[PDB]
Amino acid sequence: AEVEVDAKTGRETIIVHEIPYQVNKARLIEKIAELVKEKRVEGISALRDESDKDGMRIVIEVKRDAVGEVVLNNLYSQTQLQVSFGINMVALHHGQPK
């Protein structure tokens, strides 16, 4: 993800291009909307999806008195924009687990 700043008005938005492995996009959007509704994350005004044949595109707009980087870090910490993967390599060798 990244932050784009308007040349004239100075408003800034967040654009998401890719998502982690084994993540549902609709559930992520619903979770973000639910977090915004209960006032647990501050600095979000608009939220919509614009993915098309070109590629994934998620648009998030911030308020007038907020910093985009802080909101992005909070989204990293609270939502599924970052996930943990536990590696555990087990396979059958000569008919035995190892």
Partner: protein
């Protein structure tokens, strides 16, 4: 089950009706999200010509369609000026059952909402049935 669009002007919006969830997903994955919406259905619909008014009201698919259209029913609060899409397109399968469902939908629209048909807000789509490849 509705996949609404983003355009707010009703004169620049379209609505598609499909038979089921498989066709609904296939259409959703290949639409234009800006000014196109998809609304699935469930099998064959009730025949309102042989049914009663209370029986029609008690149905579920008819209620969902009425809610999606947002014009009202019963010709008492039914206002034809509250229509939310100025283009309604019927898109069923290319076999005979699609023709049967099309006849049922036409019967419903003509018997219950004549003004929509009179103004010209109903369209019919023509998907293909065969694909031939040589070389």
């Amino acid at each position: 089950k509705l996949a609404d669009c983003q355009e707010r002007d009703p004169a620049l919006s379209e609505l598609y009706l499909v038979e089921g969830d498989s066709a609904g997903g296939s259409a959703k994955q290949g639409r234009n999200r800006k000014n196109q919406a998809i609304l699935p259905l469930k099998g064959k619909i009730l025949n309102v010509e042989k049914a009663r008014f209370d029986k029609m009201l008690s149905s579920q698919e008819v209620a969902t369609l009425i809610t999606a259209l947002g014009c009202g029913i019963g010709r008492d609060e039914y206002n034809p000026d509250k229509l939310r899409y100025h283009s309604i397109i019927i898109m069923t399968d290319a076999d005979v059952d699609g023709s049967h469902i099309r006849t049922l939908l036409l019967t419903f629209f003509y018997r219950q909402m004549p003004e929509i048909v009179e103004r010209g807000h109903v369209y019919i789509a023509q998907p293909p049935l065969y694909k031939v490849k040589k070389g």
